[PDB]
Amino acid sequence: DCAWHLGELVWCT
Amino acid sequence: DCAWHLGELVWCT
Amino acid sequence: GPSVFLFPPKPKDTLMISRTPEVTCVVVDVSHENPEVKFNWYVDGVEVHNAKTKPREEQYNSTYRVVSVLTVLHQDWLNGKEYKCKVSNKALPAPIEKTISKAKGQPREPQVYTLPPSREEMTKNQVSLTCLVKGFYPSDIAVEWESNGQPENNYKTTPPVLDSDGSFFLYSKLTVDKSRWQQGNVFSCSVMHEALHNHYTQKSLSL
Amino acid sequence: GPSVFLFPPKPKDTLMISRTPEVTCVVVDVSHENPEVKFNWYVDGVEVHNAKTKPREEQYNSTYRVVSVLTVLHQDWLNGKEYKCKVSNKALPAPIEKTISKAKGQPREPQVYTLPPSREEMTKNQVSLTCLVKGFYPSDIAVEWESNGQPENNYKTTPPVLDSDGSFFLYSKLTVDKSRWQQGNVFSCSVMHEALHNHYTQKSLSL
Ligand SMILES: *[C@@H]1O[C@H](CO[C@H]2O[C@@H](C)[C@@H](O)[C@@H](O)[C@@H]2O)[C@@H](O[C@@H]2O[C@H](CO)[C@@H](O[C@@H]3O[C@H](CO[C@H]4O[C@H](CO)[C@@H](O)[C@H](O)[C@@H]4O[C@@H]4O[C@H](CO)[C@@H](O[C@@H]5O[C@H](CO)[C@H](O)[C@H](O)[C@H]5O)[C@H](O)[C@H]4NC(C)=O)[C@@H](O)[C@H](O[C@H]4O[C@H](CO)[C@@H](O)[C@H](O)[C@@H]4O)[C@@H]3O)[C@H](O)[C@H]2NC(C)=O)[C@H](O)[C@H]1NC(C)=O
Numbered sequence: 001d002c003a004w005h006l007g008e009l010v011w012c013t
Numbered sequence: 014d015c016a017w018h019l020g021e022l023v024w025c026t
Numbered sequence: 027g028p029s030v031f032l033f034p035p036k037p038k039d040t041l042m043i044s045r046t047p048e049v050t051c052v053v054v055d056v057s058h059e060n061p062e063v064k065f066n067w068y069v070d071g072v073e074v075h076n077a078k079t080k081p082r083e084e085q086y087n088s089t090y091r092v093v094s095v096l097t098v099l100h101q102d103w104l105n106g107k108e109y110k111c112k113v114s115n116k117a118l119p120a121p122i123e124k125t126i127s128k129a130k131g132q133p134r135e136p137q138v139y140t141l142p143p144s145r146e147e148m149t150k151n152q153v154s155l156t157c158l159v160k161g162f163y164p165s166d167i168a169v170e171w172e173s174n175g176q177p178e179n180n181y182k183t184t185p186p187v188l189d190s191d192g193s194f195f196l197y198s199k200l201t202v203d204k205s206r207w208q209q210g211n212v213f214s215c216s217v218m219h220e221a222l223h224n225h226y227t228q229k230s231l232s233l
Numbered sequence: 234g235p236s237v238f239l240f241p242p243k244p245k246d247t248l249m250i251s252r253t254p255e256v257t258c259v260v261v262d263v264s265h266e267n268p269e270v271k272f273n274w275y276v277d278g279v280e281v282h283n284a285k286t287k288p289r290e291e292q293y294n295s296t297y298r299v300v301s302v303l304t305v306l307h308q309d310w311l312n313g314k315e316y317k318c319k320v321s322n323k324a325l326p327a328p329i330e331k332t333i334s335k336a337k338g339q340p341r342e343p344q345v346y347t348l349p350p351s352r353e354e355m356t357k358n359q360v361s362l363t364c365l366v367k368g369f370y371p372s373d374i375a376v377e378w379e380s381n382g383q384p385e386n387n388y389k390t391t392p393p394v395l396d397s398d399g400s401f402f403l404y405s406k407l408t409v410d411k412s413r414w415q416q417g418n419v420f421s422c423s424v425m426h427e428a429l430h431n432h433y434t435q436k437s438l439s440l
């Protein structure tokens with residue numbers, strides 16, 4: 001799954 | 014009056 | 027003689043796959059008479075060749091500042107690979123070498139706890155929203171605040187302090203209008219660190 | 234040539250009437266050929282004579298360390314008086330003068346708020362008691378913790394951070410066994426600063 005900071009892609013496992 | 018820190022005199026007005 | 031300073035990439039650039047981290051080799055006190063500077067880059071001893079030289083910059087104090095930038099791979103940095111920059115110039119009897127890499131030590135996941143303002147604070151103009159980020163390693167981290175998906179810029183974060191267990195902790199304080207907090211508005215503490223799942227976690231704060 | 238470093242007194246020594254604050258003029262890199270050093274002290278330009286020289290100390294790196302200590306009056310320091318130390322030595326082209334005094338700016342009283350551990354932290358073996366000290370000026374301060382009149386040494390305090398209003402704030406974290414917290418034990422955050430009534434204030438925290 002992924003993580004987003006203010007719309008920006010942070011990281012995905 | 015005065016203020017004490019762990020028994021020690023700090024200050025008095 | 028010239029001096030050299032090697033800088034690590036920004037925490038946010040290493041933790042976000044949407045950004046490009048880089049190591050910067052800065053050479054100061056470069057002379058006007060011999061500004062030719064040769065750079066040799068190595069990654070774990072193996073010489074690499076994809077570095078670029080930034081445009082030369084006159085410092086106005088009789089010297090130039092020559093800089094080389096090396097792009098790194100997120101995983102290479104996070105995996106503790108060592109980057110060495112060798113600087114050669116005619117005014118240098120022998121080449122200067124600096125080495126930098128991530129801090130060595132098992133990475134530990136930061137625990138993030140949001141703390142509401144004190145009852146005693148409910149009488150002032152603005153209240154303080156606290157975010158405690160503790161138990162993390164290494165100290166490379168990024169902490170920000172937001173509300174309704176919008177970034178809140180009115181905050182100050184203490185530098186990382188080394189705790190008694192070999193980990194780091196810090197505190198971030200966001201200052202807002204009592205009204206906002208009172209109204210039930212939702213505020214959040216965004217933390218980015220390599221040890222977090224997906225290098226991310228948010229902690230909400232409201233009533 | 235020798236080098237000089239002038240240090241201010243400890244915050245606790247200036248804030249407690251039961252202690253004796255002092256300014257310390259340290260001279261390093263003193264040579265064996267010429268170890269004799271003359272000191273001239275001044276307070277707002279007026280030369281004073283009650284300073285004492287600490288016993289000379291061999292540094293083992295080919296130099297000595299000569300130190301002069303000047304006792305100051307609590308009120309003189311707190312009132313912003315300037316202390317100047319002049320150092321003279323035959324290996325020095327001209328006397329060296331350093332000046333130090335309290336930070337200038339209107340003193341502001343620190344607001345102290347104790348913050349309990351996050352309910353989420355209760356799953357851990359030990360918990361964090363926070364103490365927010367903000368809105369203070371100057372940064373000279375002393376923060377400690379206690380319980381039942383006994384000092385609690387298991388804490389870490391962030392260095393003062395400059396806030397957006399020109400004042401300073403910091404956070405202190407005391408870590409205690411979860412059992413102690415859940416049992417109703419009362420803990421206190423003791424803060425000492427010149428702008429507080431009698432330079433002291435204590436704020437308690439319990440379940
Ligand atoms: C001639 O003039 C030169 C320029 O002077 C002018 O600039 C001002 C800064 C003043 O110096 C002023 O006098 C002038 O107006 C002058 O150069 C300076 O020389 C110093 C001594 O040789 C040197 O000191 C070292 O500084 C290190 C820290 O430097 C950083 O931080 C300062 C400010 O905090 C900043 O000015 C520097 O530019 C550095 O900033 C970092 O820059 C890097 C690279 O750009 C950034 O990292 C990259 O950033 C990019 C984006 O930009 C990407 O993100 C990339 O991924 C990143 O890698 C980084 O973000 C940025 N950080 C900050 C905070 O800005 C110290 O670490 C170093 O300390 C070590 O060594 C000393 C001994 O030297 C020890 O005492 C220490 O304990 C420690 O071990 C040291 O203090 C200055 O850096 C240098 N300034 C510049 C601009 O180059 C030169 O000396 C003059 N010479 C003469 C003869 O007069």
Ligand SMILES: *[C@@H]1O[C@H](CO[C@H]2O[C@@H](C)[C@@H](O)[C@@H](O)[C@@H]2O)[C@@H](O[C@@H]2O[C@H](CO)[C@@H](O[C@@H]3O[C@H](CO[C@H]4O[C@H](CO)[C@@H](O)[C@H](O)[C@@H]4O[C@@H]4O[C@H](CO)[C@@H](O[C@@H]5O[C@H](CO)[C@H](O)[C@H](O)[C@H]5O)[C@H](O)[C@H]4NC(C)=O)[C@@H](O)[C@H](O[C@H]4O[C@H](CO)[C@@H](O)[C@H](O)[C@@H]4O)[C@@H]3O)[C@H](O)[C@H]2NC(C)=O)[C@H](O)[C@H]1NC(C)=O
Nearest residue numbers: 236238240241242243254255256257261262292294296298
């Ligand atoms: C030869 O050896 C000399 C001795 O060094 C020994 O230790 C190592 C260095 C070994 O390698 C070995 O050489 C020796 O065994 C060596 O001297 C050093 O020289 C340095 C550079 O010249 C000098 O650096 C400056 O340090 C300043 C800070 O000093 C304090 O902190 C250091 C480190 O923590 C500490 O070692 C010092 O002793 C200082 O400590 C403070 O001392 C004061 C005064 O006693 C205390 O205050 C009083 O405390 C009493 C206690 O009862 C009362 O409370 C009273 O009220 C107080 O007033 C204070 O508490 C204490 N603090 C701490 C934290 O311990 C920096 O300020 C300075 O940096 C500034 O200035 C430079 C230049 O302008 C700038 O570049 C900086 O940016 C900054 O602006 C600078 O870094 C060392 O201090 C000095 N070490 C000692 C012990 O004196 C010498 O150089 C060697 N020479 C050769 C050729 O090899």
